[PDB]
Amino acid sequence: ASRRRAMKSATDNADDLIKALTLAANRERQAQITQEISEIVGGANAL
Amino acid sequence: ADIEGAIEDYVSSFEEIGTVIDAGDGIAHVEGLPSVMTQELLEFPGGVLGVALNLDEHSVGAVILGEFEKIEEGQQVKRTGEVLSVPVGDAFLGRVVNPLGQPIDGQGDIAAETRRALELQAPSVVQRQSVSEPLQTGIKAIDAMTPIGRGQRQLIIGDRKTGKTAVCVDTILNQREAWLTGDPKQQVRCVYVAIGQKGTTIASVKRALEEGGAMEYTTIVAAPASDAAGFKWLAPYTGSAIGQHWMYNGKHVLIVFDDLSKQADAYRAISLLLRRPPGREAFPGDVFYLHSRLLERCAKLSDELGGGSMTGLPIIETKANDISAFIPTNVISITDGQCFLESDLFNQGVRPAINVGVSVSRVGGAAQIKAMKEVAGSLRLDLSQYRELEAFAAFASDLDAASKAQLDRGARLVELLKQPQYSPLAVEEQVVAIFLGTQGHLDSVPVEDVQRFESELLEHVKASHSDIFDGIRETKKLSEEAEEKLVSVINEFKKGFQASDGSSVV
Amino acid sequence: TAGRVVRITGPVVDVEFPRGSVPELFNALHAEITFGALAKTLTLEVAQHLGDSLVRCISMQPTDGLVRGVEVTDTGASISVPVGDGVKGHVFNALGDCLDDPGYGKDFEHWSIHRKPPAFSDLEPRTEMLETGLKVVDLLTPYVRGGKIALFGGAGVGKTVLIQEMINRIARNFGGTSVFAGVGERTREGNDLWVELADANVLKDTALVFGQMDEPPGTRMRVALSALTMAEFFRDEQGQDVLLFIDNIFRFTQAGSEVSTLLGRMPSAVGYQPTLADEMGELQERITSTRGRSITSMQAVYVPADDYTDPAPATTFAHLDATTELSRAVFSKGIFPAVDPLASSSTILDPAIVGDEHYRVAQEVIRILQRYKDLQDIIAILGIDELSEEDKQLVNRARRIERFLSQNMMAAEQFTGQPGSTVPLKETIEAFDKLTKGEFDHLPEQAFFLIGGLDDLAKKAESL
Amino acid sequence: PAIVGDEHYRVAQEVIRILQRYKDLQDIIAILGIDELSEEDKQLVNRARRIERFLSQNMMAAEQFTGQPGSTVPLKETIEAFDKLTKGEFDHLPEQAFFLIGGLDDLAKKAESL
Ligand SMILES: Nc1ncnc2c1ncn2[C@@H]1O[C@H](COP(=O)(O)OP(=O)(O)OP(=O)(O)O)[C@@H](O)[C@H]1O
Ligand SMILES: Nc1ncnc2c1ncn2[C@@H]1O[C@H](COP(=O)(O)OP(=O)(O)OP(=O)(O)O)[C@@H](O)[C@H]1O
Ligand SMILES: [Mg+2]
Ligand SMILES: [Mg+2]
User: Fold this and answer.
1) Which chains border B (3 or more CB–CB pairs < 8 Å)?
2) CB-based contact (8 Å) between C119 and chain A?
3) Which long-range contacts link C352-359 to residues 24+ away (Cβ below 8 Å)?
4) In angstroms, what separates the C-alpha of C9 from chain A's closest C-alpha?
């Protein structure tokens, strides 16, 4: 019974950690896109 | 030799008309207008207005405010003679106006007292005064846990559909009792600024304020999602100017910016269209200034300047409740506290979804009335520890007597802070309600009925024992005699209260 | 002779002069705004020479209402601020105009806010610990008397409350002068600090130079130099010990970034000005203490989006003898002052300076907290119950150490109501030596929360 | 399989399969522990560690990285050794015996030295 409870808690924590890491990875994905575009258009504006 | 004189003569020589030479997606360049001021308001032939941002040697680059579709090359642009400014006055109460002060509610024109510039400096350090009197929001959670004082900047931050407008509309509605007093030192005037919100949501808000009798002291500055970036960029500033005209006259204003993340988006659009190199998340470096400039004018003026105040409830719409993003962090570092509304709590029926933990009020406490601070002093820590203990106990094999008592008290406190929309509570009713819970009088009531037991109980007090409410309202303190009378009334009511479970709540 | 305003781009104004009278860099120019409520004497600061006798300038007040062609007269000297003993006890803006007494300080000695840093031969390192009474600061991040201290932290983590706490702990009993420089913090906070210092009677010994957020970027970036010039006068001329509280120096860099965008300079990594390191060095190297005369400086550094890799904090990290990095994670657990014990550091946490006992206790605490951090990912999924029994014990005493680094700060009374407490350094070392050795790992964790000492620890333990 | 032969291809693909399964399991092992894996997966992990270490080799150009001289392993011997590993004939030897050896004879010598 304690293993059931502990593994349910572990699964819930893993799901919450997956959600947090997915939100993060989305933030760095958007930030990488932005930064790449900033570099590209900074080179463009100077040339 | 004579060239310098001759050239100088020319500069000297300068109802003057310029002509548009470029135009596109909000920005129009106007050659001529040698005597235009920076931030001057230029009127184009179709009644469209623009702000002269850049003043080059040659033409002037202006951000068009409104229908930029009607701006075309060769059109005549003529000065208004007024730096970026909007009409102000009491004629704006009960009206819906666009960021330029032009009415859009279909009623008549507004009789402005004067014109106020949108970019006047905020009160200096010596011109302000410590926030010392409360702005009752009518929300038990906010007025008990993170109280707002007049002159404070409180940030309503949360995700979509987390209940943020409501927490602002309820705050505006709760000022009707103060308005009916007729005392300028008590009346709180409201300016609800809608930036990029759906037109139907502005209509809803106006309907709610009308059915609550709140429009007779509220002004709505509407910049719906259909309007260009210029309107969504000015709307907070015109709202703050309407409010400032009252603030400097001794009146107390409540400004709601709904939502400042859309002003930031509009300013980002304008900046990128001006080809200004962006920074973090594509926002310009001025994006902080944009908001710091705006919320710094919400202040509690010193008694030398009439003692007026402007309270700001800026709204920020976080994405995936990421309170560490750029604009949210900027506004948190600008404002005096945040009411963080979580979508997790709000989806599970806890509405207002005030996350007690992250939510805080820096400037409050000094503003909270004595009775509320006495009854609600321990509420915040109790609720936070209850959330943590409920997270712990969800998987623990057993709960001690003290732990179970804490859990039972916290569940009833949460159910007590739960409150229906467009149903703000007077401060005395909130005092009694939080008294019911913090003093354990709810421990004998089943959780599911806490909302009803409370809701009915206040009615009884309004109907048969108003002396308690009158005392709390007048002396701003819950006296021990009134406390004993309230306890007696609570016990008397619990005898006749019919619980849903059937069991007596005595 | 005077010039003309040729281009206006927000708070940046281009002004053209006759070929023989182009002003030098950092000169102060005066223009006139004559429209209605915006009428003022606009103060510009020359930033670039664009050629053809044009000079690009940064406006100190908002340019709103300025017109092309208005006369601009150069003063021949840079923005000068009043300096002297009479400066103490008053509130100024970036331009030296007093706010409480509008005409005050017009006859004092005036000093340019632009000056070279002290020559390298005048600099010597400082290594004297400054006992604040905060457990975390005194143990893991010992502040340096005459050194440069910083309080990093995202939005709403307690930087300003720590600045107030260190004013209450250092400036309150300080024998010398103090200077507080708002550099883009709330005007409400400036007024609160003014009234608090007046109430504590510390105002008479401190000079305030605010230039807060509503100000344009020009003043928002020159206010730090103005306050630092007042402090430099108190240092070099009057021979006093000086406290220089700066709240917050990221707002100086941010104003610089805004100006750079307006000045036309190409953006750096993440939009900041290319001169970010140069400007920050110019500001910070002046805040150094010279050989025989000390200037203790404490600086709040806002970290945008809680990104401690942002170029501005990353640049300012190299200028500090002690750094206290406030963390959102520690804040969210209720552990005020919210210091990150692992990221914060000081240059004097060296056994030769703080002693072998202090160093040993600090390093053992850091080891325990680092091991706890390394286990954090497993603790997130499975909890302490899955760890080994040498790590389980370590994690328990790490949680107790983490909660014991918290303190009931004296500035936190306004929020909590609980009065503040001060822990002497020896008692802190003893308490943490005991905690790391496991002499308190049987008490509940909450017994260590916001307690401040061993006597209070025993008292609270009982209460629980 | 048409160029290197069916034996070489099979051994290479089995090694890659074992290593990919080990890479997938490394996340589990670091948190839930090896003891919670399946018996087959546990045996596979023990196989994969030895295979990773056996892919290491003391190259001649790296004498100044390790001190010991370089070694050359014929292709036939490599295929035979990895077929034995992937099939299990060396699960009894310690994994450190497979580190920087280069060949079956060196494997035996280093195992005896352990
Ligand atoms: N206290 C409450 N109790 C019950 N329902 C509520 C409460 N507050 C809000 N709601 C409902 O929740 C929904 C979302 O409310 P609201 O529009 O006020 O949130 P919001 O933050 O404005 O969302 P958005 O601005 O993203 O549209 C609405 O249907 C509203 O009626
Ligand atoms: N020691 C403390 N005890 C209790 N509450 C605290 C403490 N420190 C901070 N807080 C809470 O956190 C808030 C943050 O305070 P502070 O003004 O110092 O923030 P900050 O991180 O410096 O933010 P900003 O970016 O606006 O300068 C305080 O107003 C109070 O609400
Ligand atoms: Mg809404
Ligand atoms: Mg602060």
Assistant:
1) A, C
2) no
3) C353/C127, C353/C129, C354/C129, C354/C142, C357/C429, C357/C433, C358/C139, C358/C425, C358/C429
4) 19
C385 and chain D in contact, CB less than 8 A: no
Q: Residue B197's closest CA among B171, B235, B247, B167?
A: B235
C18 contacts: CB under 8 Å, gap ≥ 6: C1, C3, C53
Q: Give which of C434, C437, C460, C416 is closest to C135, Cα–Cα.
A: C434
The residues, ordered by sequence, that sit 6+ positions from B374 with a Cβ below 8 Å of its Cβ are: B477, B478
Give B259 Cα–ligand 1 centroid separation in angstroms: 14
Of A10, A14, A42, the CB nearest to C267: A42
Look at residues B319, B339, B371 and tell me which one is the last residue of a structural domain: B371
Look up the CATH number of domain D6-113. Answer: 1.10.1140.10
CATH hierarchy code of domain C356-463: 1.10.1140.10
Domain C3-81 class in CATH = mainly beta
How many other CB atoms are there within 10 angstroms of residue B383's CB atom?
22
- Which of these is catalytic: B115, B128, B362, B452? B362
> Which positions 313-372 of C are in contact with B (Cβ < 8 Å)?
328, 332, 334
Is the domain of B15 the same as that of B135? no
Contact (Cβ atoms closer than 8 angstroms) between residue B329 and residue B178: no
Q: Which CATH architecture is the domain C82-346 placed in?
A: 3-Layer(aba) Sandwich (3.40)
Q: Is C189 a catalytic residue?
A: no
Cα angle: B500, vertex B502, B506; to 5 degrees: 100
Q: Which chains are adjacent to chain A, needing at least 3 Cβ pairs under 8 Å?
A: B, C
Task: State both tokens at B144.
Answer: 């008990």
Residues of A with CB below 8 A from B277's CB? 38, 42, 45
DSSP A1: -
Please indicate, yes or no, whether residues B317 and B354 belong to a single structural domain of this protein. Answer: yes
C301 lines ligand 2 (CB under 6 A): no
Answer for the pair B165, B258: CB distance below 8 angstroms, yes or no. Answer: yes
How far from D61 is each of D57, D65, D68, D69, CA to CA, in Å?
Answer: 11, 8, 11, 9
**Residues B255, B313: Cα–Cα separation, whole Å:** 6
Would an 8 Å CB–CB cutoff place C352 in contact with chain D? no
| CATH classification at residue B440 | 1.20.150.20
Q: Please name the amino acid found at residue C94.
A: A
Residue B358, ligand 2, Cβ within 6 A? no
Q: Which domain holds residue B330?
A: 87-371
In terms of domains, do B120 and B55 share one?
A: no
Which residues in chain C are closer than 8 Å to D31, comparing Cβ atoms? 377-378, 381-382
Alpha helices in C54-186 (DSSP H): 135-140, 159-166
Last residue of a domain, one of B323, B352, B371: B371
**D15 to chain C, minimum CA–CA distance in Å?**
30
Instruction: Please give the residue of chain C at the shortest CA–CA distance from D27.
Output: C378
| Residue reference for tokens 């969210």 | C332
Q: Which of B445, B415, B434, B436 is nearest to B145 (CA)?
A: B434
> Can you tell me the distance from the alpha carbon of B48 to that of B98, in angstroms, rounded to the nearest whole number?
13
The last residues before gaps in chain A (C-N over 2.5 Å) are: none
Listed in order, the ranges of chain C carrying CATH 2.40.10.170 are 3-81
Q: Is B79 a catalytic residue?
A: no
Resolution of the experimentally solved model in angstroms: 2.6
Q: What is the CATH number of the domain that holds B6?
A: 2.40.30.20
Check whether residue B75 and residue B100 sit in a common domain.
no
Q: Give C378→chain D minimum CA distance, Å.
A: 6
What is the Cα–Cα distance from C214 to B288, expressed in whole angstroms? 10
3-state secondary structure of B310: strand
